[PDB]
Amino acid sequence: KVVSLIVPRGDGAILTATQNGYGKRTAVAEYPTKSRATKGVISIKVTE
DNA sequence: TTTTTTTTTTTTTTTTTTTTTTTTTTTTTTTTTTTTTTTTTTTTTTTTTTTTTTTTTTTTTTTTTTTTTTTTTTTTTTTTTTTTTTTTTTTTTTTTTTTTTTTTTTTTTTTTTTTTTT
């Protein structure tokens, strides 16, 4: 689990995750919840 | 009139030093070889309407393992000190300007003499 990239909030806006093999997706920053450090996974995409 | 003392430059040739001819090592320089940029056209790739059957998200409910959690003791973090490097004031040296002071060299042309080589 190599950390690919970090992005701040900035403002209410749309995140766009992507994939190696032509995978492209968009989502709103309101969806992913927040918590303290040293935590687990929030499934962002359907990989593999 | 004969004979006696002292002084130096030469017979000097050898020791010391200097001068003058030499050729190993790091810094230049010309060559070939590999990275860049602009056109033709060319099959080839690629942009954009229409239809279509698809396959993943959103009604609703479930749980469990990652999110809660408190606490011991480490160990990375910070503090002081000192060394190494970077960078900028300071100083020194050198060059150019225009009137002055000084100098120094390379060749033709002919004819005669020295001065080496064969």
UniProtKB/Swiss-Prot annotation:
It comes from Escherichia coli (strain K12). It is found in: Cytoplasm. Belongs to the type II topoisomerase GyrA/ParC subunit family. Heterotetramer, composed of two GyrA and two GyrB chains. In the heterotetramer, GyrA contains the active site tyrosine that forms a transient covalent intermediate with the DNA, while GyrB binds cofactors and catalyzes ATP hydrolysis. Can form a 2:2 complex with toxin CcdB in which GyrA is inactive; rejuvenation of GyrA(2)CcdB(2) is effected by CcdA. This is DNA gyrase subunit A. When the enzyme transiently cleaves DNA a phosphotyrosine bond is formed between GyrA and DNA. In the presence of quinolones this intermediate can be trapped and is used as an indicator of drug toxicity. The enzyme-DNA intermediate is also the target of a number of topoisomerase poisons, including toxin CcdB. A type II topoisomerase that negatively supercoils closed circular double-stranded (ds) DNA in an ATP-dependent manner to maintain chromosomes in an underwound state. This makes better substrates for topoisomerase IV (ParC and ParE) which is the main enzyme that unlinks newly replicated chromosomes in E.coli. Gyrase catalyzes the interconversion of other topological isomers of dsDNA rings, including catenanes. Relaxes negatively supercoiled DNA in an ATP-independent manner. Negative supercoiling favors strand separation, and DNA replication, transcription, recombination and repair, all of which involve strand separation. Type II topoisomerases break and join 2 DNA strands simultaneously in an ATP-dependent manner. An N-terminal fragment (residues 1-523) can be reconstituted with GyrB, but the complex no longer has negative supercoiling or ATP-independent DNA relaxation activities, although it is capable of DNA cleavage; ATP-dependent relaxation is inhibited by novobiocin and non-hydrolyzable ATP analogs. The fragment has ATP-dependent DNA relaxation and 30-fold improved decatenation activities, unlike holoenzyme it preferentially binds supercoiled DNA.
